[PDB]
């Protein structure tokens with residue numbers, strides 16, 4: 092099991108391209124074993140990086156020598172994990188939604204939820220992962236066949252544990268509110284919802300068994316010691332090097348070609364075979380953003396005004412509960428340019444209401460968010476999802 | 488019994504001094520019957536005001552015709568209220584209680600914990616109600632102590648509800664959690680849950696939005712003094728109102744309000760209070776002195792590092808983000824407020840909290856957020872109490 096005692100997470104501010112390029116020099120030094128949480132992008136995008144203890148002085152002196160400002164977001168990564176492990180140690184009503192679960196625990200949850208709600212909920216298998224694990228989607232439906240549908244996925248990046256944990260909560264919430272809250276009942280009486288809670292099962296299993304900081308898939312790359320592809324750079328729209336890496340060791344390695352990862356191709360084949368997906372929402376952490384296309388280019392989507400207004404309503408709804416502030420905009424404007432990310436592809440297929448979320452927080456814990464924040468994160472995000480779903484329903 | 492059907496809460500933005508004055512001009516207008524949640528202060532300080540159903544048209548028209556930009560924070564105040572409307576083990580901490588329910592709770596907690604908890608009456612309110620402080624102590628007499636108060640402004644109901652939760656928490660953790668037991672083995676804790684009982688009974692019986700005391704003001708139709716403008720530190724200087732109808736009316740002399748005088752007497756008679764924490768809502772702020780003047784406190788660096796640690800601790804639980812600083816820097820100039828007085832008496836660890844939220848609900852926070860507010864606030868309180876214990 093990887094440990095991280097004395098590892099720090101630094102947030103580096105890069106004020107111009109020159110400073111971006113200096114941080115890219117650090118990234119190129121594989122011996123430092125750096126783990127970028129938010130990689131070099133453009134000037135003014137903060138660069139968040141986990142630095143192993145023996146690399147800390149070298150990194151700090153480098154940044155200081157070049158006048159590049161940084162702050163220490165996390166002083167001791169292992170303290171957060173030990174805490175996480177510590178608070179980690181029947182029916183869906185007695186399931187603990189306020190802790191983090193393993194892949195087996197989540198998959199057991201899926202079967203319990205189906206067993207308890209056979210007229211609403213079914214489980215679909217859309218593929219098997221690189222390592223052979225089944226990939227499962229929950230389908231919530233009141234009838235029809237291939238009704239217009241909302242697709243939601245969480246955990247495409249395995250280390251973003253609050254997203255799988257929110258997915259589990261959303262699945263339970265849907266079953267609680269169907270037949271009970273009329274406004275939500277109205278959504279499901281017309282639309283199906285598909286929910287993929289563990290979108291990268293191999294990386295997820297790997298975050299529990301081996302390396303809590305694992306992001307990518309677990310595919311092997313011929314003649315490289317580095318494993319895995321960033322599934323959020325592996326989609327066939329805008330694929331390439333302006334916003335992803337051809338280096339197998341990169342956190343944003345895009346693979347050899349689009350849809351090389353079965354976890355991505357399974358969703359592509361599903362969506363195309365279904366043919367009537369009307370909203371597609373892909374959920375990540377962290378940064379508190381709600382985004383619409385495009386990531387790969389600056390040209391607005393033709394539906395930009397409508398999607399921007401809907402984004403504004405959705406973050407206002409989210410903020411209603413706890414005041415959590417999300418910014419919104421195209422991917423390229425709100426966060427950075429990225430090549431081959433999911434909703435560029437889904438929008439290109441005709442799914443107008445294509446959105447991607449980056450949930451809590453804004454870097455103090457990053458993806459090591461305390462379990463105690465699972466439910467608040469899930470509750471607020473559900474209000475944003477309801478906004479998108481109501482719009483999908485009433486304003487197609 | 489007030490209802491608020493169709494009342495809105497507006498958040499008014501003021502860019503410069505001239506604009507502040509224009510808003511301050513409709514603060515003067517009794518007929519509008521406005522209720523400022525966050526009054527006119529300096530420029531760049533949002534003004535939050537509940538404007539009544541018959542007055543909404545009138546004030547919307549006033550603002551626009553003067554170019555003051557504003558946003559509508561709360562659309563139907565009633566909706567947030569209709570939403571609202573044995574032992575300490577089975578007491579419901581996730582709901583708001585009445586005065587008598589809280590006073591009954593005080594007796595139940597004392598009865599269940601007779602060697603740790605005692606009730607003390609420090610005075611009576613203007614209307615004659617007893618004013619009670621719970622003392623948590625493991626012995627001695629006038630050991631160094633921490634003072635916490637909630638509810639000095641009656642409408643800030645999450646504070647009294649949190650105070651009830653803290654009382655129970657102290658009884659649960661004492662003798663079980665060593666870090667907290669270390670606090671009470673050296674220091675006493677005084678906790679005043681309902682610091683303004685008349686105003687509290689009034690928020691239940693007549694008017695949910697009541698803030699002040701219920702004292703009658705000689706030669707005025709208006710009732711009550713702002714107990715957090717009535718302390719003898721900067722009394723009557725910029726940062727309070729001399730208008731008896733104002734939310735921030737300072738009264739005729741410092742300590743005119745028996746609810747404030749009773750605390751002042753207690754503190755002076757005790758002489759060993761080492762930390763004093765006065766809790767309010769809303770705004771998500773943790774502040775130290777001064778509110779009445781810009782001069783920093785001699786202890787500013789220490790207090791500011793302590794505040795940073797406390798807000799970091801608080802945020803860990805549910806992500807709630809608090810800003811911190813002197814009152815004057817972090818919110819606005821305010822005169823005659825509690826911690827300027829307590830700090831002037833040598834009480835180094837003088838802090839005032841503003842709890843959830845930052846305006847969606849204001850003081851009409853849903854009962855489902857009581858326990859999360861109280862839990863996260865308790866982490867910040869532990870930070871201050873550890874510091875009082877270990878670094879006098």
Ligand SMILES: CC(C)C[C@H](C(=O)O)[C@H](C)S
Pocket residue numbers: 248323375376377378382386422426429432447449
């Ligand atoms: C919309 C995308 C491009 C956001 C981002 C990423 O994949 O880099 C996540 C924060 S991991």
Ligand SMILES: CC(C)C[C@H](C(=O)O)[C@H](C)S
Pocket residue numbers: 640715767768769770774778814818820821824839841
């Ligand atoms: C520190 C003081 C000025 C606090 C403030 C007030 O009394 O106005 C509360 C937010 S009600």
Ligand SMILES: [Zn+2]
Pocket residue numbers: 247248251374375376
């Ligand atoms: Zn991600």
Ligand SMILES: [Zn+2]
Pocket residue numbers: 639640643715767768
């Ligand atoms: Zn107050």
Ligand SMILES: [Zn+2]
Pocket residue numbers: 873874877878
């Ligand atoms: Zn200490």
